[PDB]
Amino acid sequence: TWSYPVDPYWMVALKALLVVVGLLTAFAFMTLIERRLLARFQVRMGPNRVGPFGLLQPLADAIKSIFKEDIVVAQADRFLFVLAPLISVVFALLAFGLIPFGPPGSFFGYQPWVINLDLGILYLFAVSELAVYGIFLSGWASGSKYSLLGSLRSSASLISYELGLGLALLAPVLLVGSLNLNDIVNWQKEHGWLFLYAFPAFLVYLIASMAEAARTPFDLPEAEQELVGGYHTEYSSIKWALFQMAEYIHFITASALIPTLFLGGWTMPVLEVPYLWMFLKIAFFLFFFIWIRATWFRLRYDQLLRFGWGFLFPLALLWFLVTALVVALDLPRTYLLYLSALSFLVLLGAVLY
Amino acid sequence: REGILFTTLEKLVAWGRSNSLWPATFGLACCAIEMMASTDARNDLARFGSEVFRASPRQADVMIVAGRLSKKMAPVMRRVWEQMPDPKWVISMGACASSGGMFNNYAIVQNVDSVVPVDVYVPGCPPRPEALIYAVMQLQKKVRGQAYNERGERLPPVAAWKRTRG
Amino acid sequence: MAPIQEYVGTLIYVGVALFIGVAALLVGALLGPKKPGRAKLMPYESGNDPAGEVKRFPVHFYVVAMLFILFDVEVAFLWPYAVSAGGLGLYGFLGVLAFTLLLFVGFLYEWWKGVMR
Amino acid sequence: MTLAILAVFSVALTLLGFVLPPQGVKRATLLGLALALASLLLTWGKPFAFGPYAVDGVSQVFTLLALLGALWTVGLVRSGRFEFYLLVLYAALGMHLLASTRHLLLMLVALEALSLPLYALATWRRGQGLEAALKYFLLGALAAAFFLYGAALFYGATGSLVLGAPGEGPLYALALGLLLVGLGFKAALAPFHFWTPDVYQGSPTPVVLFMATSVKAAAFAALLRVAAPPEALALLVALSVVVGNLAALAQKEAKRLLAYSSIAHAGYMALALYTGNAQALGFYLLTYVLATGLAFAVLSQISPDRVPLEALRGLYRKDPLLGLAFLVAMLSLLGLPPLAGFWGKYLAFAEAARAGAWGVLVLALVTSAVSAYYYLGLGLAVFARPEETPFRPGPPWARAAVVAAGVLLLALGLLPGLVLPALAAGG
Amino acid sequence: MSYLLTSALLFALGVYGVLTRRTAILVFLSIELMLNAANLSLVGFARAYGLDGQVAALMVIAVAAAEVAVGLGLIVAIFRHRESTAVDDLSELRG
Amino acid sequence: MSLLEGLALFLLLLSGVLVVTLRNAIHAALALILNFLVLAGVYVALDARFLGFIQVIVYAGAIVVLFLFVIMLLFAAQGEIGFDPLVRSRPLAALLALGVAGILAAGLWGLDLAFTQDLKGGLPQALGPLLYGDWLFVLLAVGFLLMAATVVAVALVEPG
Amino acid sequence: MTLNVGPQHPSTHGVLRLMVTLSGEEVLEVVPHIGYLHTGFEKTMEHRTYLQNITYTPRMDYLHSFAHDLAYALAVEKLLGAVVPPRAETIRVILNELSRLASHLVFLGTGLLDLGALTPFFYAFRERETILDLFEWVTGQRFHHNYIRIGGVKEDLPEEFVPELKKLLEVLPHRIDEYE
Ligand code: SF4
């Protein structure tokens, strides 16, 4: 923000309030369409009763969740137990609303981003670390040692990928030379789309966003059919819903960021109309993950560490150094172009026998 | 409060509970696989309540006792039931659950209904999936406050804000 | 500098999010039936006790955690380099490589030794 | 350039150690150090700054000593797990850097580079050796914290993180002290001595060798560059020399005896610091390292695990050469011409009087006569009857080494006028 | 001036920590607070004498982090076969 | 400044009190997280932004997670285990503690400086040239320290 | 360490209870504990007629019901020395291997579901429904057939069962390949 307007505090508040409750309502109807899209994949029909079209079922469901007993375990210490969902939702909500959506003033005369800071990327990275607080603490909080073992499994996995997320994100930061999202968007407006120019850093970022519970880790643990699920399985009322809520808000946040950064979320040579085109990129990734969600299995935790830690970080750091060379001597950008294109041929050919 | 003050509110909440019934299955015996059936594809239960099969009894609500109930299994079940949040119903599916089925032995327990109280019985063996939908339709109209016995008298929504966990 | 205004704007936001969070939780909390404890003392599985006593947990979790800190310190340092990187020139790049290989040596020790032990 | 060999070797060996069996890493590391020593010699007296890293006359003398001590300790060890050679290497690098800087942030980082591998080297897993480790670490992290806090207040008072900036009123006075705490503790000037008796006792002998020479050298190295007030010193020296010599009468176990002694010795060296001369302090530390090095070698050859006073007895019977070596060593530490130990003392005392600081200097001299009690308590004990106690003979390697050391002691005793010319400030 | 005074107070608290606590892990925890008392000071003066105290701090953090890692590693390794995690009851070295 | 400023510095001190008082380990550590957050804010406030974000990322996100994992692995059911002959030591602890604030207070009181010199918010833009400039050795030293830290840390825990 | 993987919690696909003695993370041994479903066939059948007994054998293996029945059918049939006409032997194999398909189909359905995500369950079941509906025609029930009495099946196949059986024989090869 040295080129973009500030808005007075009140107007900030208004946007913030909109986006928060926006993400409640978001989450509501997202659950329904995802639910239904799974059904179709498994040659079935989803919810479609509770008139008019299934679109009141989340209301019914939500209303059900409240008006239930507040189960508070004897074996849980009170303070952490009640607190623990709270932390996990707060730090999940925060920093969706960073991401730009359209050029300045296009919200009745106001900015579509809520905040904009002066260091974007750090803020994202930072909020991603604080989710992991919520997780393991909840485990401990409930005070069952079974729950505890689950939460550590979970956190262990998260924390491993979490570092990898960092080394993945350096590559486009080189190219634009600034941190804030806006600069990244606007750079792509001219120069054109970071998924072209740094393909292996795209890849690892994608596959790192898997680790935000997207399915295909998924010996998360879950609770059903397995060694107990972290966090949940001791929560009951509204609080339980909160945990799940958080997990989805992560899902859509990641589904938005991959467009914002790597595809230019409001970049578009066809027409740029502010909001509209963003939602279409969102929609695409949304659908991609559900196809994953259905059609593949899971990784057994042991396997999962080997995969992120051992394989993923060497592809990330190899790319960081190469691009760091190119960017350092400030050479033509062609030389990355060639490399991206070649790496794609490797990673395409790899599927082909 | 408890959901029951204004006429208006309580009818809301009662709709709320009734159409969202998330089934927690307690597969046990031979019934069980036909109970799993009630989800996949040809039939459904994902358009009344929901597909989900709750991953703890802690966060569940309608417990479907589907199968033979061995005597040794009874105190476990007693406890599984006890730890459900307060509005909780037990559909007892299959003859084996409902009245001990044919086995009259020392082993099997005649009528799950001794232990946990039942709300809807659904006779059959295995009651074929469409029958199971019918049972849950019943339990639906039960929680709305529209359930009767043959003598002509209504029943209160649950039948288990009655004997509870003491 | 850059606007301190926009850091304030974060604080506002945090206040909103936290508020809507807590608001939802307090509605949920205050409404609901109750039957006093006497058997909701118990947790998941088999009546009381979820699974035996476990007293100790493996070093696996320690190792994973420990990795993350040391390499997070790495990342911290590699951010300044990421930003100015035409100004630091070729000598810059040599600085980066040296540092990177040092932390990579770290890596190879923990990799050849193991993350399940 | 000396740094060059160490750093390179350190990294290279890291990965190498997977290929070789454990002995090959001992052979390798031993070699490495010897090369690092070579590289020092051929550039003697020529200085190279690069800003942060800063080769001086001082550096050259004190890391010469430090590498010596480190060679010895790597020598004797036979135990598995490639790390118990590797770590000694690391630590040496840490000391090399420590001496060769003035800039405080580097100085801290260097302190950690040397202190970290030391905590871990404190365990061959003997139960005591975990306790030892623990004490040293907890107390260590506190003194660390002070040294960091000191630096932060220093940056306030001068406007630099280099040492040798101007200074003034209260904050600079304060600040200059808090730097002395960290550095002070690592060399153990009482009262900061507390760990030195437990940790030396608990830790297994060869490790303790490394610690008792080299770490003390390196720590002192950095101490000299600090401008330490004549007032601060007067406290430190007095307490060190008093607590050192007096308390040492009470003990009856070898390691602890030498531990308390090395609180006294830290005190004696600290006299040189008044004017500050690395000719005086240089000399001192040479005589101290050799003598302690010799003495502690012998203690490894007894047992690697704590020995009572009695065990030293009869050393002359079992082997004549060793019996004499250890003898000479013990007198050299007492300060008694014409062994070098007197000269080491004399040079230090002379700098105290030159700067003029009398009361302190007297205490020092008095209590050094006290010291003769426990030193004869070892040094003569050698000739008495042998009792039933271990004494594995040790290599032919080491026998030659020990006797070399004892000859280097008494040689400079009669002929100090060889080395002193070139341990000078400009060389 | 206010902040820099505060740092010295925060140091004072840390000392109170180190002496009081009777759990090993919480000793170590207290040390970490002291290290941040420092880092604040370092920044505070950094506004006065410009820019280098920033870089200073960053290096300091890193040293702290390193010293965390090894220390907690040690604390674990000492008590991973007993669980009376008091910082006394190491009495066995004394003569 | 003293209107708002007062609150934030109060919070810092308060948070400090808690982490050395509270008699359950987790509650302690968790308070300390609130401490370092506040402190992160105070970094941002002093024209040092980058350092703020690194404070959260490293010190409150990395370091303290390591703390917590240790305190879980081995329990910590009381943060004051031992009623011990050193129970006498509580008033002496409080005494010396006061002393160390006093002596430090002296050194810092009456100080005169400038506060004029503009860091420029200490954004990573302006940090680049120093960091990989004159401090580049120190950085590499840091880097070596880390490598040693890794090697040591592994060798301590797992007998390798 | 001592994990008690409970009886029917969260599942096992039984009601098995396992005392898992764990060292670290690599299981030493699992001690199984059964007795949570012994409902006593062996006793009860000692107090029922032979005709009645065919309604007690398929209440054991749920999935592969017809195999139990058949196995029993032979055992008595042998005992009292009856024969069994040629058409009977045909019917008994056609149903028996059709029921085998039921068992494997449900098995692979659970297997994929068990660990692995949701989807393959539904396909494996869909085909199973078609098998059960064919069955429904001829024995009158989805499972728990009562369609074998001592000497052969109790009534001829309905007319409609042979055409529709042909339908499912077309589809199965293509489907089997798609499970693979
Ligand atoms: S009622 Fe029938 S299908 Fe059900 S468990 Fe009993 S025998 Fe099986």
Author numbering:
A (entry chain H): 2 to 354
B (entry chain 6): 16 to 181
C (entry chain A): 1 to 117
D (entry chain N): 1 to 427
E (entry chain K): 1 to 95
F (entry chain J): 1 to 160
G (entry chain 4): 26 to 205
Task: Give sentences from the paper.
The conformation of each class and the distribution of contributing particles in each dataset did not depend on the presence of NAD+ or NADH. Cryo-EM density for bound NADH was clearly observed in maps from NADH data and a weak density for the adenosine part of nucleotide was observed in NAD+ major state. Major states are at a higher resolution (~4.2−4.3 Å) due to the larger total amount of particles than in minor states (at ~6.0 Å resolution). Both conformers of the major class (CXIMJ:NADH and CXIMJ:NAD+ states) show almost identical RMSD of 2.00 and 2.19 Å when superposed on the CXIINT crystal structure. In our conditions, the NADH cryo-EM sample should have been fully reduced, however, the density for the key β1–β2 loop in Nqo4 is not sufficiently resolved in the major classes, so we could not confirm whether H384 flips, as would be expected, in this case. The distribution of particles indicates that major state is energetically more favourable than minor, and this does not change upon complex I reduction by NADH. Structures of CXIINT and CXIMJ states were very similar at both global and local levels, differing mainly in a slight rotation of PA in the CXIMJ state. With the exception of this rotation, both structures share a high degree of structural conservation, which suggests that in practice both of them represent the same conformational state of CXI.
In bacterial complex I the 14 “core” subunits, necessary and sufficient for complex I function, are shared equally between the peripheral and membrane arms, together forming an L-shaped molecule. All known co-factors of complex I reside in the PA: the primary electron acceptor flavin-mononucleotide (FMN) is connected by the redox chain of seven Fe–S clusters to the quinone-binding site (Q-site) at the interface with the membrane domain.
